[PDB]
Motif scaffolding. Structure first.
Motif: not given
Lengths: 159, 159
Positions: A7, A12, A66, A105, A108, A120, A124-125, A145-146, A149, A153
């Motif tokens: 990310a 990220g 990403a 982005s 996924w 999300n 996502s987390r 968050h990152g 992500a 990915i």
DNA sequence: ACAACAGAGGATGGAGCT
DNA sequence: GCCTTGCTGGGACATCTT
DNA sequence: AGCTCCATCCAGCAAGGC
DNA sequence: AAGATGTCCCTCTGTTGT
């Protein structure tokens, strides 16, 4: 067989998926640089390189990154920072011998169902915590968050 | 003290260039390798990261070779794409050079010009007479930029 | 077709269906 | 102290003159 | 090959909350 | 040590002239 997901934003992360070995994830190293009046948070290119070579990864390992696609409503600085982190990661990875494959982005969300509705806030987390139970402790806070992500990915590129 | 090793100046824009100043050797310049990428409905040129690392590795420069890169500082009047592309080429160059083992020094665009736009090619043409044949078409302003950035870098003391 | 110039500052990508 | 919302979308750099 | 929809962020700088 | 002020690109899409 290794799969790396990145990310590229200033907060990220990088995910590493070695075959037959437990998963990993790393926050993107950063630093503080003065920009005009005030300090800004930017990616630490030196520390990223040492984090990459410490993996001792096979030459030509595929790294899924990403794509930076900001919105028109976003400020000029957001666009500049978006391409900056994207280009820096591309530049570091290509120079380090990795094979880079950009990915959107929304990619996924195809294999891991997610929509605008049911946004999300933590979907996502904790869908990433589901796919990677070893890293469940690293995704409790909202600041992860990152980390989630980059894990999604890499999982997208693996499958 | 004065820098006795190689100095390199880079104009990170899409049509930028790179200048190499070996000590007591013919100075060289290179147009930044680019390629045409599909984006949205059209096609635009962007920096070819893979060809850039192939150019730099052909130098076989000593590790820690000082590279001076012009900072990307767009105007508020410029479009979001201008800001995005500005950070992209700036981040990619820094990422490639740091990963390749170079020492990267960001230099503001005002710094090297204050040391010495329409006249920039003739200033570099007289400063580097060997490459004067390349500075005849005003589209080579990126070449003259890399030269004047590199010439500015050798005048900066190091440790 | 490539260059020079002029002018304003700009989403992008993907799925679907014709 | 370090998260967490919350909200808009943003120059940066140098040289002067208070 | 179009040509419709419809999805996708992050950066940065303030206040508050733990 | 802060403010005032003036400078510095590039991108991208056309059009025009080699």
């Amino acid at each position: 067989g290794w799969v790396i997901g990145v990310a590229p934003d200033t907060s990220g992360a990088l995910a590493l998926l070695k075959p037959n070995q437990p998963p990993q994830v790393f926050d993107s190293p950063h630093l503080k640089v003065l920009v005009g009046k005030g300090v800004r948070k930017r990616l630490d290119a030196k520390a990223i390189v040492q984090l990459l070579k410490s993996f001792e990864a096979p030459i030509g390992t595929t790294v899924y990154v990403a794509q930076s696609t900001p919105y028109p409503q976003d400020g000029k600085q957001g666009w500049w920072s978006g391409g900056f982190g994207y280009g820096m990661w591309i530049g570091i990875l290509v120079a380090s011998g990795f094979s880079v494959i950009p990915v959107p982005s929304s990619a996924w969300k195809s294999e891991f169902q997610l929509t605008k509705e049911r946004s999300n806030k933590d979907y996502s987390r904790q869908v990433a915590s589901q796919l990677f139970p070893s890293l469940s402790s690293l995704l409790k806070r909202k600041k992860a968050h990152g980390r989630a992500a980059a894990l999604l990915i890499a999982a997208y590129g693996k499958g």
